[PDB]
């Protein structure tokens, strides 16, 4: 078996370029909880906030377009539809509100969560919504009639995150009981349970192509192949915890933001960490306020947007020089257990 | 009996009311599950523990206690079937295995633990776990078994310090050939292991000594000389090597500076003098 681990030095994974800080956008009165980008045109992005607003930022120039009020408590998660001109926002005030983009007003409230709802996922093909929160369940809403059609009972604790996939398991959910469940919605029961995490799973991201899912915990970032549900890879991590956010670029780049401010880029295929950064917090902030609460890659995949606990948005750009002049990353040491 | 009946009833109102409110706080479950035991009713108590496994199954004090109440009254195949559910739920754990192993000791059945350690080794647990399996066969014999134990055991930890316990104990068998057999295999396997593995720590001064002192027990002058040459090959009247070991160590002493290197030049030159004369 280790004869293979002798050959496991033959891969030498996939060089990638280093990431650097292009621009910093202030302008939010609270923390920036969540970020979503225009799925079609990469023209602008939306930003949840502690201060209850949402602001639409112009992506090219970083200027501000319009602000969207309408929640009385923080806005935890945000989704913008590929197929619709709709913005779905969700808050800690137990409410899930649609936003018709053409007129920029509220359209449809979705009612019937018990307590705060921290996540929204739009099903790709079905005109459904998936939301979940401290209530420990997922509700699948008919987007047109605002009916909580299907309620997926499951995790024994608050659900942190929710994803949607077109084929089987259509709903991936990750709660604080350290279980990532893969749901069968038509039968309303769990297809497969992934227990390998030690503690609460605070972030999950879907790969734009490969059809797999990444999960995160304190020290551990795993991956999982959907369908079967098998473990695929692991990601090498020294104690980086807490992992708040994962995002996957088209290029097999995997970003993991921390609560220590340390940004950690990986290589999705290998599980190698090819860089680490630390944000420079802000002028008058505290060392406690240096962290990363969200993230995304735009559709091109060359620019990363992460809102941070210092009330700032930072757009992280990939270096054009790069290659192997001096890129070389943390340089591939496969330590053993 | 009403001096009893209303006692049991009033208690079951108070305990459930609290657990009704707090699903968590296992401290109450075990207490209340203990109350129904001391009433000599196993049916209720088993329900309580089973009710309390739903709340949290990762809490081992609950798991352990619910082994006790089964063992104390000696309900065997329950505390037996339970251990099917117990260690298949939390297979990593330490305490759950040993409490299942050590309770199988007092039942005198070594066939069970033989197959227990089969799986518990198949799971590749780690140091302290394996050592209980190798040392258990010291209680038993399995001298043909124990050799195959370390067969798999250094497949789980392909590291040198575990080989040290193989070469240690395989002498204690009282067979020199079986012991020697793997040193030539330590030539073949380790070198093929280590050289093709960049780098898992294998060849250290402590491995070469394991070859060395082996031949001292068999009193071989040549088979030691093979080692030095074979080792020094792959490293990164009879007082000749006394000078060679001293002179190499003298030059081996690092010398940063001018006077430090010139001080060392006095040492190795005297060593060369007393004992490539042009290149020195």
């Amino acid at each position: 078996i280790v004869n293979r681990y002798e050959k496991l030095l033959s891969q030498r994974p996939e060089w990638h370029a280093p990431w650097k800080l292009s621009r910093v956008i202030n302008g939010h009165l609270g923390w920036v909880r969540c970020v979503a980008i225009d799925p079609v045109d990469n023209e602008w992005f939306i930003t949840g906030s502690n201060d209850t607003t949402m602001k639409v930022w112009d992506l090219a120039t970083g200027k501000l377009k319009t602000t969207l009020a309408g929640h009385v408590m923080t806005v935890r998660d945000v989704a913008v539809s590929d197929r619709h001109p709709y913005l779905f926002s969700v808050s800690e005030d137990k409410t899930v509100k649609c936003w018709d983009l053409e007129k920029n007003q509220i359209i449809r409230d979705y009612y019937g969560h018990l307590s705060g709802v921290r996540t929204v996922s739009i099903h790709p093909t079905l005109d459904l919504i998936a939301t979940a929160g401290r209530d420990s369940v997922i509700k699948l809403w008919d987007m047109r009639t605002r009916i909580p059609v299907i309620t997926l009972v499951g995790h024994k604790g608050p659900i942190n995150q929710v994803q949607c996939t077109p084929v089987d398991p259509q709903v991936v959910s990750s709660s604080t009981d350290a279980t990532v469940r893969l749901w069968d919605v038509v039968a309303g029961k769990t297809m497969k349970v992934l227990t390998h995490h030690k503690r609460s799973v605070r972030a999950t991201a879907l790969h734009p192509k490969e059809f797999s899912v990444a999960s995160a915990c304190t020290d551990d970032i795993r991956s999982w192949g959907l369908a079967e549900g098998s473990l695929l890879t692991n990601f090498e991590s020294e104690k980086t915890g807490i992992i708040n956010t994962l995002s996957i670029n088209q290029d097999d780049v995997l970003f993991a933001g921390g609560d220590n401010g340390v940004l950690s880029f990986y290589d999705y295929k290998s599980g190698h960490k090819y860089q680490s950064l630390a944000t420079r917090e802000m002028v008058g902030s505290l060392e406690g306020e240096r962290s990363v609460l969200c993230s995304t890659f735009d559709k091109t995949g060359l620019r990363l947007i992460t809102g941070e606990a210092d009330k700032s948005i930072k757009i992280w750009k990939q270096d054009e020089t790069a290659t192997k002049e001096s890129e070389p990353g943390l340089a591939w040491n496969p330590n053993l257990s | 009996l009403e001096e009893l009946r209303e006692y049991q009833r009033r208690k079951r109102t108070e305990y459930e009311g609290y657990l009704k409110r707090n699903r968590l706080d296992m401290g109450q479950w075990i207490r209340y599950a203990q109350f129904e035991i001391e009433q000599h009713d196993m049916r209720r108590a088993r329900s309580i523990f089973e009710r309390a496994l739903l709340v949290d199954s990762s809490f081992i004090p609950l798991w352990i206690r619910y082994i006790d109440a089964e063992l104390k009254v000696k309900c065997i195949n329950h505390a037996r079937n339970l251990m099917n559910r117990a260690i298949s739920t939390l297979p990593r754990v330490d305490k759950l295995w040993y409490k299942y192993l050590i309770v199988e000791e007092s039942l005198n059945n070594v066939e069970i633990v033989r197959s227990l350690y089969t799986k518990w080794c198949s799971l590749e647990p780690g140091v302290n776990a394996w050592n209980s399996f190798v040392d258990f066969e010291i209680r038993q014999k399995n001298w043909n078994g124990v050799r195959e134990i370390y067969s798999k055991y250094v497949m789980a930890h392909p590291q040198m310090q575990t080989w040290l316990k193989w070469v240690r104990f395989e002498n204690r068998h009282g067979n020199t050939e079986f012991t020697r057999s793997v040193y030539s295999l330590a030539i073949d396997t380790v070198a093929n292991l280590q050289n093709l593995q960049i780098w898992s720590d294998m060849e250290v001064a402590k491995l070469v000594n394991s070859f060395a002192h082996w031949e001292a027990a068999q009193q071989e002058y040549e088979r030691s000389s093979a080692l030095y040459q074979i080792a020094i090959e792959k490293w990164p009247x009879x007082x000749x090597x006394x000078x060679x070991x001293x002179x190499x160590x003298x030059x081996x002493x690092x010398x940063x500076x001018x006077x430090x290197x010139x001080x060392x030049x006095x040492x190795x030159x005297x060593x060369x003098x007393x004992x490539x004369x042009x290149x020195x």
Binding site: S212, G225, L232, T233, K269 | M83, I87, S88, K119, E124
Partner: peptide, 22 residues
């Protein structure tokens, strides 16, 4: 015990090869 868990389950699939096709 027996039928519930397997050694492979713990082990990841990709670690051996980085070219596996999902």
């Amino acid at each position: 015990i027996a039928k519930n868990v397997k050694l492979d389950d713990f082990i990841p699939k990709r670690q051996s090869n980085f070219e596996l096709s999902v």
